[PDB]
């Protein structure tokens, strides 16, 4: 049971330490985490796979030939499922793969993700952004002078568009926003960075 979060040197004041609740490395359950991911990656499914059944094919019902004395196998309409001109048995139908995952679990799984990011140390919440002004060149520097060399795909979660503006167009960087704080991104990214305003809401959401 350990819980201590980092915080980059704000303006000219040393690295401040801040922490609270079983938010940091508490008791992680991989399962719960994975289920919240399917839910995310799933409910984001388009679901537009369609096929025309025999009732739906553009052929006729007229009986190809007579049920008897033809010396040919018996048949109905060309549309039947066998036959090359096909019909398709149990083909795909437009449908929603989106279910309702328990809301209380959509949280314990949000906190737990911002937990295995803390214990690893890859967690880190800032407050200032000297080289902001919405320029990549500007941002790219701000990282080096922080610990963000580019060797660890990062997740940026700050309520400041000006900053996104930069982080955005970077490979190893995954922009975002506070309200959109999920688990699929936290996990896909090696290192997580969060502002104290987007962090401010984090808990208002968790508890």
């Amino acid at each position: 049971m350990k819980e201590v979060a980092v915080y980059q040197i704000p303006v000219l004041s040393p690295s401040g330490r801040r922490e609270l609740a079983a938010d940091l490395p508490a008791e992680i359950n991989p399962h719960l985490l994975w289920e919240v991911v399917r839910w995310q990656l799933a409910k984001r499914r388009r679901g537009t796979a369609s096929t025309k059944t025999r009732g739906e094919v553009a052929y006729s019902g007229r009986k190809i030939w007579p049920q008897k004395h033809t010396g040919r196998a018996r048949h109905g309409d060309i549309g039947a499922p066998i036959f090359v001109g096909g019909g398709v048995v149990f083909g795909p139908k437009p449908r929603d793969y989106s279910y309702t995952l328990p809301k209380k679990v959509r949280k314990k799984g949000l906190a737990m993700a911002v937990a295995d990011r803390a214990r690893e140390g890859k967690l880190l919440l800032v407050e200032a952004f000297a080289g902001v002004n919405g320029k990549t060149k500007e941002f790219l520097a701000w990282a080096k002078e922080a610990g963000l060399d580019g060797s660890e795909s990062v997740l940026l979660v700050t309520g400041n568009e000006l900053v996104r503006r930069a982080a955005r167009n970077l490979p190893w960087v995954v922009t975002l926003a506070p309200e959109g704080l999920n688990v699929y991104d936290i996990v896909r990214t090696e290192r997580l960075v969060m502002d104290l305003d987007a962090w401010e809401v984090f808990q208002n959401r968790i508890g």
């Binding site: 992680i28 991989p30 994975w34």
Partner: protein
């Protein structure tokens, strides 16, 4: 936690049951190998034989209702002071519904077993015997609704 490893727990068993091949549930398709199971059987929840279903038993429930419909009526949902000793102070429906029982289930009685805490219990009717337990310190709100 690494990206490629949150993996399904130890029992997601996507293992469906395809019934077509040489070994396993197969050919005649895992199950059936006779006939009258090719696109449907009759039930059997309640059907077949061709005989008296088991519908030989008669209707007691004498009052299946006329055609106008069921008759409007005050519905009483009794509660146990047993489950009532979970909180103290003022005990009235509303603080009761959004709490435990009732849930707009119309009116509220009150009876239960077990020890009763010496307070006020605002109910619509009290069960004789289970009211002598409130004769050992408590309240007795009655009627209401208008």
């Amino acid at each position: 936690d690494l990206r490629p490893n949150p993996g399904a727990n130890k029992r997601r068993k996507r293992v469906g049951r395809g019934p077509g091949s040489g070994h396993g549930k197969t050919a005649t398709r895992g199950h059936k190998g006779q006939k009258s199971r090719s696109g449907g059987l009759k039930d059997p929840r309640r059907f077949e034989g061709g005989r008296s279903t088991t519908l030989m038993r008669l209707p007691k429930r004498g009052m299946q209702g006329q055609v106008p419909g069921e008759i409007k009526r005050p519905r009483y949902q009794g509660v146990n002071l047993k489950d009532l000793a979970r909180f103290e102070g003022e005990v009235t429906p509303e603080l009761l519904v959004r709490a435990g029982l009732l849930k707009k289930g119309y009116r509220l009685k009150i009876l239960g077993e077990g020890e009763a805490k010496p307070l006020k219990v605002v109910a619509h009717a009290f069960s004789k015997s289970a009211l002598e337990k409130l004769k050992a310190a408590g309240g007795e709100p009655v009627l209401l609704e208008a």
